[PDB]
Amino acid sequence: DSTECSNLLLQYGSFCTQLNRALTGIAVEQDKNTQEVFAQVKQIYKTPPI
Amino acid sequence: DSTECSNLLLQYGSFCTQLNRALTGIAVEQDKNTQEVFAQVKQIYKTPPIKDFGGFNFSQILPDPSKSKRSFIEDLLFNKVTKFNGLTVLPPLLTDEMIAQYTSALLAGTITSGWTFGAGAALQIPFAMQMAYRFNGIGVTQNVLYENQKLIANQFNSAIGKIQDSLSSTASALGKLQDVVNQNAQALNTLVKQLSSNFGAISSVLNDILSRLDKVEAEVQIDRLITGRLQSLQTYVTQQLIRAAEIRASANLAATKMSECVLGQSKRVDFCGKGYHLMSFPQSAPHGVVFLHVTYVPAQEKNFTTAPAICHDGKAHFPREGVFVSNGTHWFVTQRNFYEPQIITTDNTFVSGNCDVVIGIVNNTVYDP
Amino acid sequence: IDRLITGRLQSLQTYVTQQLIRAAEIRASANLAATKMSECVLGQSKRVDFCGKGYHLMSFPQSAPHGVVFLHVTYVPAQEKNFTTAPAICHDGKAHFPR
Amino acid sequence: AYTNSFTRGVYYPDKVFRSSVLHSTQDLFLPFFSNVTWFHNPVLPFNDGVYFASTEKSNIIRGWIFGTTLDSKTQSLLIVNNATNVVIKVCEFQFCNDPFLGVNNCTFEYVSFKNLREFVFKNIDGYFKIYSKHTPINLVRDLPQGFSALEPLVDLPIGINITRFQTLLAAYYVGYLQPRTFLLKYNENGTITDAVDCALDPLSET
Amino acid sequence: KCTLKSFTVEKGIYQTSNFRVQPTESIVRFPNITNLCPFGEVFNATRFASVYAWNRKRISNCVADYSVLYNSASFSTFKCYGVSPTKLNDLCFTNVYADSFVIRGDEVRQIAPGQTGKIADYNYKLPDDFTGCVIAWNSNNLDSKVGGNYNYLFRLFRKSNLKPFERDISTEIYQAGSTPCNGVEGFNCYFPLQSYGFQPTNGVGYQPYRVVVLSFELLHAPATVCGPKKSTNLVKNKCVNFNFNGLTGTGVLTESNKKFLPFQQFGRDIADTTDAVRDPQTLEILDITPCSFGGVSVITPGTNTSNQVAVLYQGVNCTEVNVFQTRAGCLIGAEHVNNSYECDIPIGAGICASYQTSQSVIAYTMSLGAENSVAYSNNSIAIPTNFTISVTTEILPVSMTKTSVDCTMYICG
Ligand SMILES: *[C@@H]1O[C@H](CO)[C@@H](O)[C@H](O)[C@H]1NC(C)=O
Ligand SMILES: *[C@@H]1O[C@H](CO)[C@@H](O)[C@H](O)[C@H]1NC(C)=O
Ligand SMILES: *[C@@H]1O[C@H](CO)[C@@H](O)[C@H](O)[C@H]1NC(C)=O
Ligand SMILES: *[C@@H]1O[C@H](CO)[C@@H](O)[C@H](O)[C@H]1NC(C)=O
Ligand SMILES: *[C@@H]1O[C@H](CO)[C@@H](O)[C@H](O)[C@H]1NC(C)=O
Ligand SMILES: *[C@@H]1O[C@H](CO)[C@@H](O)[C@H](O)[C@H]1NC(C)=O
Ligand SMILES: *[C@@H]1O[C@H](CO)[C@@H](O)[C@H](O)[C@H]1NC(C)=O
Ligand SMILES: *[C@@H]1O[C@H](CO)[C@@H](O)[C@H](O)[C@H]1NC(C)=O
Ligand SMILES: *[C@@H]1O[C@H](CO)[C@@H](O)[C@H](O)[C@H]1NC(C)=O
Ligand SMILES: *[C@@H]1O[C@H](CO)[C@@H](O)[C@H](O)[C@H]1NC(C)=O
Ligand SMILES: *[C@@H]1O[C@H](CO)[C@@H](O)[C@H](O)[C@H]1NC(C)=O
Known part of the structure; x- marks a missing residue:
């Protein structure tokens, strides 16, 4: 949160967008991975009482 | 153009060759990925002149000669999906017409010969008899096809027609291919915008530095641009090497689906779509493949009383290839995937010793032919 | 010296990154070779073109430097003849199907 | 008295042709739907730059004065429409604006309700910029809806510092420019059409 | 062989180089030559400035050409200090000035950096590191008169020396004793001016020379003066280096069908690369295409098979480079063949x-395989009668060399 550094970091262009975009793609994959493993069942089947 | 920059860039040595070696390794791999998927047929099995396939109607997925000679659905797929600063884009080895000749050969061989063209020479089989083998392969007896053949054929024609023409109504189905187009375009635009960036230099325009500054200081400002532009170009080829590894995984999966679905019949659950798999047809799409998996799904939910075995002359009988079921008053044996009751005979069944051992055995009669 | 440190460090980061990406491709090939050992050598695969082109009978592993060779043995049908065929035959007014 | 600015005053940010494209820029602009002052003749602060717009039928507005003092001690800018022409000059002037027809320590000179005029005035020591547009309207006292794009008239060589301004003499409105990010819809003819004020609301930011 | 660092090459296609179409000429374009600076008033007047009270012009808001002053035969001497007269036509300034006076032929030499004596110390003072040029010309026909042209005067006496660039017009009576002069001549009290007494018969050291001194300032307010701008003919459908209004680039210039607005000067593609320009000398909008470039690849059998090769210019048309235009680029040294093969x-x-x-080397469209019609009919089947047992070799990478690097031993060692 230094304003003096922040104005220099703008002179590096797209790099900081390109990293935060890469981590967002990795974040969304973790939900996809979990959905593809567990959500294979169409209905919440449940066991008889006895 | 700048010989000043070109001479400064020599101090970094081999990096300029490493990045082009890495991009060449990726570029050679598109052509391998498409040959592993499509080029797994030895001969071009044409298409027969007379369309006597029982009731089954492949005209939506067979070639259209009025057009590349794509099928109808294969032309919907292309329509729903469909540079300068030292950057160049290279053509694929197989053209879209050569890939459409391969999907044509694969489904023409499948329709006329079954799985036989995968194991050796294509052997002709009437299409209704190929479908009876594929029913027999999912544990449903052949006569369940021949006795229902017009129903099965109408129900296939409805599913491959009415429902699959949903691709005319919506483009959002092809999101996996559109994503691969968008990611490569957005990476390549990000590589170009990085030329406008200063990286701490007095200007991002290379001739502007050389026109404004004394030669010893101009070399400091240019080395600032070289450092940032080289890091930008390394970031791009690193992300393309990582992205090409997921495309290789998808191409190895698609090549495996082309062998095990399509030119086989897979017993692997949920591999070739939901339900008990019968067939699949490949259709080409830009940068990808589409499999139309044909599959058998059962349809009832009321009940029968059942037993593991039945007693007769003090001996326990077990069903030879089926289940024992009662309609409430009478006992039958059925095949297990489709309700077709049969009288319990000594050749519907096999004995295994005494009545006393089995838990839940029932007393009934076994008929002797 | 800091110019040499900066350049040689970046040279070594570029090597290690491409080595990590290349090791992932060798791991995918070793996971495939362990699956071919299990399903082709320790079993008989009913899985089309997994254990060579043809109907798979069996397979044998041989060592190679940094790899494995599988010698896949397969039945390949040959010398076919054309016949007339029928889905069923009709006898005493009843339809018979081949067992 | 106050009035709402709506979505007006989108001057072309640079002399570049662009087409079928959505360009992003960070210039000094009217923030959308902001309040502006309404008038129908005070000396006013200039801030970071001015938007001015007026109900054109009678042509009663004659020009403007800009500078720091506007009244001796240092050079100040006069711009006036002398009927067929416009006179631009930057002397150490010292006058009231009300006697407009009556108006050396000087270094430059140059000569150039039925409607809305729209004009924008901007400076950065790197020469003094005027943009404008004109459009027909209904007989309404305040700014109408829709987008308006303002075209660069002149970029005058003056080098004068400005903190204050005044007008020579319809309704007229005064708003101020602010550092703002905009997304601009250049159509197939390379005219700016629609625009998004990226800091207005979360949907615009999206 | 050099690309591969080898004396042997295996069969393949190798990218060995990149080639680019080079610019055939350089194009320059600027607006019509207009608002040329008003220097002539300082030289061509019937009157002239008198050195005891010299006159300055201001030059601003205009384009100069100082090279007229060092190519015209109208002047007897030209001198310059600090910066070359040619460099003045490259430079730019917030204001420019021209000082003027008449001096006798023996005393024009006082107009130089760091000088001393009557003219230098009491009429016109230049510092030791002055930047500017001086133009002098004989004017005995204009400025001399019978008995002497007493309008031309120099200050002989002053209270103190001039500072560098100090202008003074003072005419106060000089005092040379304890007696107060009360603003008039008298005992030890004298008029501070003298005349060269310019007469048409004078020898050259006593003849009038008109003189002008150029001077400049560049300030935080941007330059209102610059030197002259070049221009060239306009050439199209050829690769050229170009400079439109200071915008450098290299490309092919063409006609366009774009509709620029009257204030717009150049057009941009989606990635903020210029793709069109207005020619400043017409209403023509010109489209810009980058000059044709691509990889050069060498297609070879093995070197123990043959030394013959073909060359592919990737994405390049054969117009730009026995020859065959593929979709992949111009191919050279390969025979096109109407057969097809693997x-x-x-x-x-x-x-x-x-x-x-x-x-x-031959080039052909690849063959996907033999064409076959399966003998399908609704009652025909083919059944195998034999089974040829087949052994196939599958080969897989399983591991890699276990290399390790100490980064401190590699970097420093
Ligand atoms: C096959 O289906 C198409 C519609 O998709 C229809 O036009 C055509 O007549 C059908 N073919 C036959 C032999 O009935
Ligand atoms: C048959 O199974 C259904 C499954 O939903 C169940 O609701 C029903 O109770 C069963 N029938 C009888 C007679 O219990
Ligand atoms: C059971 O099957 C037999 C033979 O089809 C039929 O006669 C009998 O009525 C059935 N019983 C019930 C409860 O439906
Ligand atoms: C089945 O369940 C019923 C009710 O729980 C019970 O009466 C019967 O004895 C059970 N039979 C077997 C074979 O488990
Ligand atoms: C089954 O039949 C036998 C006689 O064959 C009898 O002894 C036995 O009790 C019967 N069991 C049931 C559950 O009815
Ligand atoms: C008969 O069988 C052979 C088997 O190779 C096949 O080539 C041929 O096409 C068949 N005959 C006809 C008339 O199709
Ligand atoms: C663009 O320019 C052409 C020709 O001047 C004109 O016909 C068209 O209406 C303009 N607008 C659009 C949106 O194309
Ligand atoms: C050497 O020649 C043989 C036969 O022409 C060829 O197979 C091989 O690829 C060649 N190798 C090299 C390195 O030239
Ligand atoms: C090659 O360039 C010439 C001249 O521009 C043109 O006539 C020709 O059609 C081009 N051919 C291809 C395939 O681009
Ligand atoms: C290829 O065949 C066409 C047939 O019209 C002919 O014109 C052409 O000259 C042939 N090419 C060569 C290189 O012989
Ligand atoms: C089967 O093929 C072998 C050669 O592979 C041949 O020797 C043998 O005679 C053939 N048998 C028949 C019955 O055709």
Whole structure:
């Protein structure tokens, strides 16, 4: 949160967008991975009482 | 153009060759990925002149000669999906017409010969008899096809027609291919915008530095641009090497689906779509493949009383290839995937010793032919 | 010296990154070779073109430097003849199907 | 008295042709739907730059004065429409604006309700910029809806510092420019059409 | 061989170089030559400035050409200090000035950096590091008069020396004793001016020379003066280096069908690369295409097979470079062949090359396999009668060399 550094970091262009975009793609994959493993069942089947 | 920059860039040595070696390794791999998927047929099995396939109607997925000679659905797929600063884009080895000749050969061989063209020479089989083998392969007896053949054929024609023409109504189905187009375009635009960036230099325009500054200081400002532009170009080829590894995984999966679905019949659950798999047809799409998996799904939910075995002359009988079921008053044996009751005979069944051992055995009669 | 440190460090980061990406491709090939050992050598695969082109009978592993060779043995049908065929035959007014 | 600015005053940010494209820029602009002052003749602060717009039928507005003092001690800018022409000059002037027809320590000179005029005035020591547009309207006292794009008239060589301004003499409105990010819809003819004020609301930011 | 660092090459296609179409000429374009600076008033007047009270012009808001002053035969001497007279036509300034006076032929030499004596110390003072040029010309026909032209005067006496660039017009009576002069001549009290007494008969050291001194300032307010701008003819459909209004680039210039607005000067593509310009000398909008470039690839059988090769210019048209225009680029030294075969060496877009029959590199459209019609009918089946047992070799990478690097031993060692 230094304003003096922040104005220099703008002179590096797209790099900081390109990293935060890469981590967002990795974040969304973790939900996809979990959905593809567990959500294979169409209905919440449940066991008889006895 | 700048010989000043070109001479400064020599101090970094081999990096300029490493990045082009890495991009060449990726570029050679598109052509391998498409040959592993499509080029797994030895001969071009044409298409027969007379369309006597029982009731089954492949005209939506067979070639259209009025057009590349794509099928109808294969032309919907292309329509729903469909540079300068030292950057160049290279053509694929197989053209879209050569890939459409391969999907044509694969489904023409499948329709006329079954799985036989995968194991050796294509052997002709009437299409209704190929479908009876594929029913027999999912544990449903052949006569369940021949006795229902017009129903099965109408129900296939409805599913491959009415429902699959949903691709005319919506483009959002092809999101996996559109994503691969968008990611490569957005990476390549990000590589170009990085030329406008200063990286701490007095200007991002290379001739502007050389026109404004004394030669010893101009070399400091240019080395600032070289450092940032080289890091930008390394970031791009690193992300393309990582992205090409997921495309290789998808191409190895698609090549495996082309062998095990399509030119086989897979017993692997949920591999070739939901339900008990019968067939699949490949259709080409830009940068990808589409499999139309044909599959058998059962349809009832009321009940029968059942037993593991039945007693007769003090001996326990077990069903030879089926289940024992009662309609409430009478006992039958059925095949297990489709309700077709049969009288319990000594050749519907096999004995295994005494009545006393089995838990839940029932007393009934076994008929002797 | 800091110019040499900066350049040689970046040279070594570029090597290690491409080595990590290349090791992932060798791991995918070793996971495939362990699956071919299990399903082709320790079993008989009913899985089309997994254990060579043809109907798979069996397979044998041989060592190679940094790899494995599988010698896949397969039945390949040959010398076919054309016949007339029928889905069923009709006898005493009843339809018979081949067992 | 106050009035709402709506979505007006989108001057072309640079002399570049662009087409079928959505360009992003960070210039000094009217923030959308902001309040502006309404008038129908005070000396006013200039801030970071001015938007001015007026109900054109009678042509009663004659020009403007800009500078720091506007009244001796240092050079100040006069711009006036002398009927067929416009006179631009930057002397150490010292006058009231009300006697407009009556108006050396000087270094430059140059000569150039039925409607809305729209004009924008901007400076950065790197020469003094005027943009404008004109459009027909209904007989309404305040700014109408829709987008308006303002075209660069002149970029005058003056080098004068400005903190204050005044007008020579319809309704007229005064708003101020602010550092703002905009997304601009250049159509197939390379005219700016629609625009998004990226800091207005979360949907615009999206 | 040099690309591969080897004396042996295996069969393949190798990218060995990149080639680019070079610019055939340089184009420069600027607006019509207009608002040329008003220097002539300082030289061509009937009157002239008198050195005891010299006159300055201001030059601003205009384009100069100082090279007129060092090419015209109208002047007897030209001198310059600090910066070259040619460099003045490259430079730019917030204001420019021209000082003027008449001096006798023996005393024009006082107008130089760091000088001393009557003219230098009491009439016109230049510092030791002055930047500017001085123009002097004999004016005995204009400025001399019978008995002397007493309008031309120099200050002989002053209270103190001038500072550098100090202008003074003072005419106060000089005092040379304790007696107060009360603003008039008298005992030890004298008029501070003298005349060269310019007469038409005078020898050259006593003849009038008109003189002008150029001077400049560049300030935080941007330059209102610059030197002259070049321009060239306009050439199209050829690769050229170009400079429109200071915008440098290299490309092919063409006609366009774009509709620029009257204030717009150049047009941009989606990635903020220029793709069109207005010619400042017409209403023509010109489209810009970058000059044709691509990889050069060498197509070879093995070096123990043949030294013959073909060359592919990737994405380049054969117009720009026995010859064959593929979709992948111009191919040279390969024979096009109307047959088709398995793909031996891949080129792209369905094209491959091989070494074949008297032998050469050939290029052909690749064959996907033999065409076959399966003998399908609704009652025909084919059944195998034999089974040829087949052994196939599958080979897989399983591991890699266990290399390790100490980064401190590699970096420093
Ligand atoms: C096959 O289906 C198409 C519609 O998709 C229809 O036009 C055609 O007549 C059908 N073919 C036959 C032999 O009935
Ligand atoms: C048959 O199974 C259904 C499954 O939903 C169940 O609701 C029903 O109770 C069963 N029938 C009888 C007679 O219990
Ligand atoms: C059970 O099957 C037999 C033979 O089809 C039929 O006669 C009998 O009525 C059935 N019983 C019930 C409860 O439906
Ligand atoms: C089945 O369940 C019923 C009710 O729980 C019970 O009466 C019967 O004895 C059970 N039979 C077997 C074979 O488990
Ligand atoms: C089954 O039949 C036998 C006689 O064959 C009898 O002894 C036995 O009790 C019967 N069991 C049931 C559950 O009815
Ligand atoms: C008869 O069988 C052979 C088997 O190779 C096949 O080539 C041929 O096409 C068949 N005959 C006809 C008339 O199709
Ligand atoms: C663009 O320019 C053409 C020709 O001047 C004109 O016909 C068209 O209406 C303009 N607008 C659009 C949106 O194309
Ligand atoms: C050497 O020649 C043989 C036969 O022409 C060829 O197979 C091989 O690829 C060649 N190798 C090299 C390195 O030239
Ligand atoms: C090659 O360039 C010439 C001249 O521009 C043109 O006539 C020709 O059609 C071009 N050919 C291809 C395939 O681009
Ligand atoms: C290829 O065949 C066409 C047939 O019209 C002919 O014109 C052409 O000259 C042939 N090419 C060569 C290189 O012989
Ligand atoms: C089967 O093929 C072998 C050669 O592979 C041949 O020797 C043998 O005679 C053939 N048998 C028949 C019955 O055709």
